[PDB]
Subunit: 381 residues, 4 copies
């Protein structure tokens, strides 16, 4: 059937998680322990130290800021680069729980639900997975292409300023050949520094989609069980517990990464809005800044939506198996459904380092914070 | 009895939902499939494309705003017009769930409650339905009458400016006959563009009133059941489940429409307060602006009140059938009432695209946001 | 014993509720229907129409405000006077539920609790009742005395300005005898206009203290029942239901009154802080303004504290009868205690017209709002 | 084993609680009533009256502030000193509940958990206890050393201003020997005034760590009980009740102390940020101000983290003993686990005088308040 398709996609995500330079863990379809090969183990470490030296250069470039304009110009790139740095460290540390996470979305067969629901669930999962992957991929590729190779293409068609923001360097980088080779190094570094948080967010969104479909199939399984004693209820409770444990495993790495992401993204959005609204931009950097805003807004909105859907499906699992059949069932079923409802009243939520809950109302509150601190940066001039 | 009266009113709402130009669905009292007649199917589509061309004209009129005054003058009408546009699209898409919604408030007989309560419930439902319909109808009619036909009447009694705000047009519309025919076209377009969200909000308020009366009759049915085994409890649980499913059906269309409504209404209120407080208005537009504020405040307050009443009645259904009889009942009743209370602890709330819950505290928070952004528009001058 | 003392105090509150001019209802100790005597029925109506004409004079005095200073000077007195007006109307309308409220705190004997706890409960109730009554009484009397009879005493010891803020009048009230007779009329009107909300708030605080002691005795009764089957649990459930119904009766009148009180009190606090911090006060009105702030802060803090204590005692009633005895009890007790805990998880809260919950965190949020709008009034100058 | 180690540390905390001058209560390892000896009873009272006279001097130094700069300079030290004053009073009053608190963390053996978990729990408890104690100790010692003995060392190496902020005194303290002896008295007073809230916060953090480990061992005990009837469940319920009562005992003293701490700490942080960002500091006080900020931020973050961990462990105790075994257990176990889950749904939270809940989101909200009132102090200049 089409199920063989889904594994194919959870192959490709693993492959792209090896492309960006994350630490190579064992994916499901490796029975010869090729994740410990020295080739990938030096490739990942080389990309990681390239990432660290580039992020450190752009970070110490921020501390040597004379005016507020150079600081606000370094804020955006330093924001995204330390986001990718936190993502690199958080995926290096927990290279064991990612094994369990990729073992979850490889076999997840819910026992009890009808097949006519399961096929439509697999179709919806495939469609939403492809949409979420391709949208961020296309937007990120076009944003990198503009932001890095538009002023270089302008100069190769035609006091240069090929790069957007300046950073600390050993040499002067004002003389002609140095600026070109630094621009090329910035291009390859920004490839390997952009594609890591996009890959992590694609994996998070795939996890959330699979968990939403698991919860819907669990609700249908409870209904089809109640429509008809022990074994179906035990399998339902076990699948509910597996969903809760998988969300608890998802919580930690993305808690640290989400705290860093949301704070630094709010700073980057405020700085970009100030540069677009106030200063005299030279029309070459504007296709970079108008796509970087769209990428950031799309990323925040998709993360908040696929985090809200899981809590909504849990609270809808609270209202499962509640009819005249429940009043006419035995005491065993009437106690087990009560236990399931009591445990399902607890919400499955992702917290960003326990400072906030990733919901859709949090996006509105953060948009209010952005709009409050945008007027301040406008009035400071 | 008087029950034949209530169906009459749920006839008229359907009729007014065909007047404003919504897509014709099958109401309860049609057994010959006359909702698929070509007459209404071209009437609705014609009013809809008139609405879209007028809203698009007023929307591209906003983007060609030189000063901040013309932008803030276009904000109010563009706000209301894109509200009506979102309402038109959301009622075109879900023309199947409106069938179920009109099937709900056509037969809703609760089994178990005494008749002496049911007659008073029908009287209260009729009174509050007539009040909510007639108040918005009278205020909207007087607001349209002032806002559109006061400066035209001033000119026909007596460098013209017959319309309030300017919009993009192919011609110049400054020469005399063009401005009059554009004013007449604006009059008929503003009729068909005002009466659609008012009709949708009347239908929402009728739904909320009927659901509140359903919940009160369910509480009385639980009390009269406990005062006296299987069949009454099964009918109670089934009616509770029907109420929850009907609220879940109400949630989606009004979620999208409420997000658009509340955001654009906050913008319109802030702009109107700035124009009334600061600038030198020429005393002809002031009867339009002082009625548009009253309509917006009345609409927001009635929506928030009839959304809060349902949650309050659900949490009061939690405290139903709790006396010394519950302690002296069997284990079947003591488990079924416990299941009803556990399911009733979940609140029945309407969310606006999951960004906020439509409550009465949200009206206070939005009034705080309005008061915060009114002082900013005053200080910007 | 000392219980005969408590009834004495719930006599006196009723007497003071007849002094301020509220509509005379039947208190507990009247078996000859003397609350329908014509003497009190004309006394209350006369004080009420005096209140309405004075509040209307001070309210139309606000609309004829040229500068912002006269408006901000009328804001405080118009605030308190329309607070008392809303209190007068809300106590005229619900003159039937006050019968039930005074029937509650006249006999409230909890069955099951030990006597050694009940005597200490009555001592604590008497002490806190006397403290809450006498504090507001002394502060209100000294505030009225300063605010009304300090500039009159200054003039009778010694271009006059005997009253603090001016109001609309038929005559000019600038000539000498008119200003003195208007000051005397203002004195007696401010007596009858100050003592009504203070009396209502004393009655609310007495209700909250009695309900807190009822909840504590209910918790001790549950513990002493579980330490030892049917009758004790039935009496416990009945007393819990009586507490919930009494709080539901308290909710409505104080909901409307609390919405008016909290909004108008926030306005009055902001205006008083602006007048004390910025302008050149002539040192005679300062003992009025420094006592009016203390009265308002004391009133808000005591209302919020005695509203928070009830919710805390309910959530502590959730943790009642939970030991190794519950694990060793029968299924009847293990189901009834579960039902009591499930119903006790619902909080007993007082909402101000459903816009906010009267808690102690709401006092902090309102203090933040006051501090935000105080800086604005300072910067406007 | 290593358990003998843990008692050693709960000796030392008691010893440091006698060093700072708190009222001497009976610790666990005193069987001869040496806490009522006259030596410690005069030592504690002498340090307390020294604390009160120093805090009163620095408090009346604040009221004689001409400019806003001297007031904002006195705000920080008066903040910390009245924090220590509230801590002294709150530990003098409740010298009886501290007996119960030190009796809790002396024997807390959970019955049912495996030993392999308990040894790792004791190791984690020892490590986190040593970390939390030593971090605050080292930072506080270096902060006192800089803030008090840096300008004195500068003068003894070399119109003086040896102390940071001035306070009221009987003499002039401008002449040379008076300023030196006042600086020495300030040194010893700031030792005895700094080490008391640090000691109280160390005791609070030790309590929170022990309670978190107790809750984790309780969850493991529930799992190991369900894996296998009466006695294990009774011991589990008794340990849960002991945890709830111990948190209720912790609530009161730290409620008053936390309200004072959080408010005065927000004021001190805002004032320090204004002095570091705006004015021309003379480079000697900057090592005091940059360490005082780090101490305050570390204290607030550790208190909020170890208050959030307990609520998270309680809500994780809600999901305890929920598998296919629960569906296959008897009605006794299926009712007792349901009662445990219903009681565990209530959160174990520490409230600061019931105005706010000490969580990690409250730290974010208070950081927002700090950032809001820092810009105001910058713009006031
Ligand atoms: C300099 C920040 C990296 C970056 C630049 C432009 C973008 O569009 C983008 O989104 C992927 C990322
Ligand atoms: C231009 C906005 C349409 C409009 C104008 C005036 C109103 O009173 C109104 O309420 C129905 C709507
Ligand atoms: C003019 C407002 C009435 C009023 C004045 C002063 C007060 O102290 C007061 O508290 C009872 C009330
Ligand atoms: C004057 C306030 C006392 C104080 C000063 C500096 C510090 O570092 C500190 O933390 C313990 C406390």
């Amino acid at each position: 059937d089409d199920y063989i398709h889904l594994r194919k996609w959870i192959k490709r995500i693993g492959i792209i998680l090896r492309i960006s330079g994350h630490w190579p863990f064992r994916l499901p379809h490796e029975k010869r322990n090729q994740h410990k090969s020295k080739f990938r183990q030096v490739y990942s470490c080389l990309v990681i130290t390239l990432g660290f030296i580039t992020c450190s250069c752009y970070c110490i470039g921020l501390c040597l800021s004379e005016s507020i304009a150079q600081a606000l110009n370094n804020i955006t790139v330093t924001s995204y680069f330390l986001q990718s740095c936190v993502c690199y460290v958080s995926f290096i540390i927990n290279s064991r729980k990612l094994e369990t996470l990729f073992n979850y979305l490889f076999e997840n067969e819910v026992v009890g639900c009808p097949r006519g629901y399961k096929m439509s669930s697999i179709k919806t999962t495939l469609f939403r997975c492809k949409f979420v992957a391709f949208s961020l991929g296309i937007l990120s590729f076009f944003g990198w292409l503009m932001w890095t190779l538009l002023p270089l293409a302008v100069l190769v068609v035609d006091q240069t300023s090929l790069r957007f923001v300046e950073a600390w360097y050993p040499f002067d980088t004002t003389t002609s050949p140095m600026n070109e080779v630094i621009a090329i190094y910035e291009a390859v570094a920004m490839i390997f520094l952009i594609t890591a948080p996009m890959s992590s967010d694609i994996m998070f969104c795939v996890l959330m989609i699979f968990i939403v479909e698991h919860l819907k199939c669990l609700g249908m399984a409870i209904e089809c069980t109640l429509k008809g004693d022990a074994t179906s209820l035990c399998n339902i409770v076990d699948s509910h517990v597996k969903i809760y444990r998988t969300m608890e495993i998802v919580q930690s790495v993305y808690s640290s990464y989400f705290a860093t992401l949301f704070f630094t993204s709010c700073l980057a959005v405020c700085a970009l809005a100030y540069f677009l609204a106030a200063t005299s931009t030279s029309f070459t950097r504007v296709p970079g800044m108008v796509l970087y805003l769209m990428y950031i807004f799309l990323r925040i909105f998709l993360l908040c939506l696929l985090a809200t859907e899981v809590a909504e499906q849990g609270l809808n699992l609270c209202h499962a198996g509640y009819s005249s059949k429940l009043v006419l069932a035995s005491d065993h079923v009437r106690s087990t459904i009560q236990a399931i409802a009591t445990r399902a009243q607890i919400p499955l939520s992702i917290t960003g380092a326990r400072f906030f809950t990733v919901n859709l109302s949090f996006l509105a509150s953060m948009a209010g914070v952005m709009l409050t601190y945008f007027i301040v940066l406008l009035q400071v001039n």
